[PDB]
C-alpha cells in the first residue's frame, strides 16, 4: 500500500493554500466555541447518563457502607 496505487478517483478537484499564506488559528473562538457546544449537545445524552448512574451508585454504596459501621442500638 503506497501512494499512487490506492484507489481509482475521478472528477475530484482540491484547492489548498500554503501554510505561509494562511493563519493557524482563524476564528478559533468565534467559530470554535459554537462548534464545541454543538459537538457537546450531539453526544451528551449518549455519554453522560452512564456516568450519572455511576455517580449515584457510588454515592449510595459509600453512604450505605458507612451507614453499616454505625452502631444500631441493640
Amino acid at each position: 500500500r503506497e501512494f499512487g496505487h490506492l484507489t481509482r478517483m475521478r472528477h475530484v478537484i482540491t484547492y489548498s493554500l500554503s501554510p505561509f499564506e494562511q493563519r493557524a488559528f482563524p476564528h478559533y473562538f468565534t467559530k470554535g466555541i459554537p462548534n464545541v457546544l454543538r459537538r457537546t449537545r450531539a453526544c451528551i445524552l449518549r455519554v453522560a447518563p452512564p456516568f450519572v448512574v455511576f455517580y449515584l451508585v457510588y454515592t449510595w454504596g459509600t453512604q450505605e457502607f458507612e451507614k453499616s459501621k454505625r452502631k444500631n442500638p441493640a
Binding site: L6, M9, H11, Y15, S16
Partner: protein, 440 residues
C-alpha cells in the same frame, strides 16, 4: 565574423511614432518576403469576470469581415496574393500579422489597419463564432498541458485578473454580446497601446508612410493594469482515467523588465528539457534529464520563465506515469536547491551557451523577428539588440546564478497544478519542505 562581429552586424530595428502615439518599428533585410503585424497591449488580464473572453472573441471575428471588406472578401484578398494572415492572444498581448511578399507590404499594411480599425462585429457572425468558440473550448480540454497551465495561472494568481483564462469561462462565451465586444475594442484597441512591426525586406520610411496613411485615424495622443498577487497554493484534479499525469510547479518569478530574467533563464537552461524521443538520454549534461532517461521517470519535462509586466511564473512542467510523480518532484526540487547553493561555473557556462543559442536560433525568419519587435516594444518599450543580450549573459557566473536562484527559488512557496492520475503527487507541505535544504 567571430560571433562578436556578427552580433555587431545585425541590422538595427528602426522605431518611429505617429502623432496618435502608434509606434512603428521595422528590421530590414534583403529577403523578398516580409512579416508585418500589429501588436496590442490587450489581454485577458485586462478583462474582469463579466468581460473575460471578449478579446479572444474579437480575435475570432477579426478576419470575418470589415465594413470595407465584407466577410470572405478580406480572406480572398489575402489568399489571392499568397499571403498568410495569423492572430494570437495571451493574457497580456494580442497580435494580428501577415506574412507577405515584400511588394505586398502596402496592401498588407492596409489590410491590417482595416482589421484593427473597422471590424464589423456582426451579430450573425457573433453567434457562429459563439458555437465555434464553445467547440474550441472542448478541444482545449483535451490538451493536458494547456489545462495544467491554465490551472497554474488560476491558483498562482487567484483573485487577480491573471488567474483568468484567455478564452474565459463558457458562460461568458454564451453571454458576450456585440456591445461587450465593441466596448472591448473601443477601450483596448488604441494607438498608444499598439505597435506596427515589420521584419524582412521592408524599408522603415515606406512602412512609416503606410502607417501615416492607414493608421493616423486611430486614437490620438483610462483603465489599465493592477498588480496581481501571487499565491503559494495547489490545485489537484484527479482523473485516474488519464494515462499520464501532468504536474506544473512555479514560484513567483520576475516581470518583463527585470534583469534577473537573464541569470534565471541561464539557470533554467542548466536544468534543461527532456522527452522520451531524445537522442542523448543518459548522457545529457542536465542531471534531471539523465536521471529521467536512465530511470524512465517521465515522458517530458520543461523549464519555463513566464513573464508579465510585474510578476511571472518561474518553474517546471513534467509529464509522467502515476508511480513516478514523487520521484520527478524530488529530483526537480533537488536540482533547484543544487543551483541555489552550489551552482558551479562550468554548467553556468553551458547554460550561457544554451541561452545565446536559444536567442539567436529563435530569431530565424521574418515572423519571429516581427514578433520580437512587437512584443519587445510592448514589454520593454524597446527592441533589445542581441549584442546587449550577449552583454547581459556574459556578466553571469555561478555566484550570480546562486544568488538569483536563492532569491527566487530557495524557501519560497510554489504554486502547483496536478492533472490526472496524481495520487502520488506529493502533499503540499512535502513540496514546500522540498523548497529548502536542511544541510544548507
Amino acid at each position: 565574423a567571430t560571433y562578436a562581429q556578427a552580433l555587431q552586424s545585425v541590422p538595427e530595428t528602426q522605431v518611429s511614432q505617429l502623432d496618435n502615439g502608434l509606434r512603428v518599428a521595422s528590421e530590414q533585410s534583403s529577403q523578398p518576403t516580409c512579416t508585418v503585424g500589429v501588436w496590442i497591449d490587450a489581454g485577458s488580464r485586462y478583462e474582469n469576470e463579466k468581460n473575460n473572453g471578449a478579446g479572444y472573441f474579437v480575435e475570432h471575428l477579426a478576419f470575418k469581415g470589415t465594413k470595407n471588406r465584407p466577410g470572405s472578401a478580406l480572406e480572398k484578398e489575402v489568399e489571392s496574393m499568397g499571403a498568410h494572415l495569423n492572430a494570437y492572444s495571451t493574457r497580456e498581448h494580442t497580435a494580428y500579422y501577415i506574412k507577405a511578399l515584400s511588394k505586398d507590404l502596402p496592401k498588407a499594411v492596409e489590410l491590417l489597419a482595416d482589421i484593427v480599425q473597422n471590424c464589423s462585429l456582426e451579430d450573425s457572425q457573433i453567434e457562429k463564432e459563439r458555437d465555434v468558440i464553445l467547440q474550441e473550448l472542448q478541444e482545449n480540454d483535451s490538451s493536458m498541458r494547456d489545462v495544467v497551465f491554465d490551472y497554474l495561472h488560476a491558483t498562482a494568481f487567484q483573485g487577480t485578473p491573471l488567474a483568468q483564462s484567455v478564452e474565459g469561462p463558457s458562460e461568458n462565451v454564451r453571454k458576450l454580446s456585440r456591445a461587450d465586444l465593441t466596448e472591448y475594442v473601443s477601450q483596448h484597441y488604441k494607438a498608444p497601446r499598439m505597435v506596427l512591426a515589420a521584419a524582412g525586406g521592408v524599408e522603415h520610411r515606406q512602412l512609416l508612410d503606410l502607417a501615416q496613411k492607414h493608421f493616423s485615424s486611430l486614437s490620438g495622443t483610462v483603465p489599465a493594469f493592477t498588480p496581481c498577487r501571487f499565491t503559494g497554493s495547489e490545485i489537484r484534479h484527479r482523473d485516474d482515467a488519464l494515462p499520464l499525469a501532468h504536474v506544473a510547479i512555479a514560484v513567483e518569478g520576475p516581470g518583463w523588465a527585470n534583469p534577473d530574467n537573464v541569470p534565471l533563464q541561464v539557470a533554467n537552461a542548466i536544468i534543461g528539457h527532456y522527452d522520451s524521443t531524445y537522442g542523448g538520454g543518459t548522457h545529457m549534461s542536465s542531471t534531471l534529464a539523465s536521471v529521467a532517461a536512465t530511470r524512465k521517470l517521465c515522458q517530458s519535462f520543461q523549464t519555463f520563465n513566464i513573464c508579465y509586466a510585474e510578476t511571472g511564473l518561474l518553474g517546471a512542467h513534467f509529464v509522467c506515469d502515476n508511480m513516478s510523480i514523487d520521484d520527478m518532484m524530488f529530483f526537480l526540487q533537488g536540482q533547484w536547491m543544487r543551483l541555489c547553493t552550489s551552482a558551479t561555473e562550468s554548467e553556468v557556462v553551458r547554460g550561457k551557451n544554451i541561452l545565446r543559442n536559444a536567442l539567436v536560433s529563435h530569431l530565424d525568419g521574418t515572423t519571429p523577428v516581427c514578433e520580437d519587435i512587437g512584443r519587445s516594444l510592448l514589454t520593454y518599450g524597446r527592441r533589445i539588440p542581441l549584442a546587449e543580450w550577449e552583454s547581459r549573459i556574459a556578466e553571469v557566473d555561478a555566484s550570480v546564478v546562486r544568488e538569483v536562484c536563492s532569491k527566487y527559488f530557495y524557501d519560497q512557496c510554489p504554486a502547483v497544478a496536478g492533472l490526472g492520475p496524481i495520487e502520488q503527487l506529493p502533499d503540499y507541505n512535502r513540496i514546500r519542505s522540498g523548497m529548502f535544504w536542511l544541510r544548507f
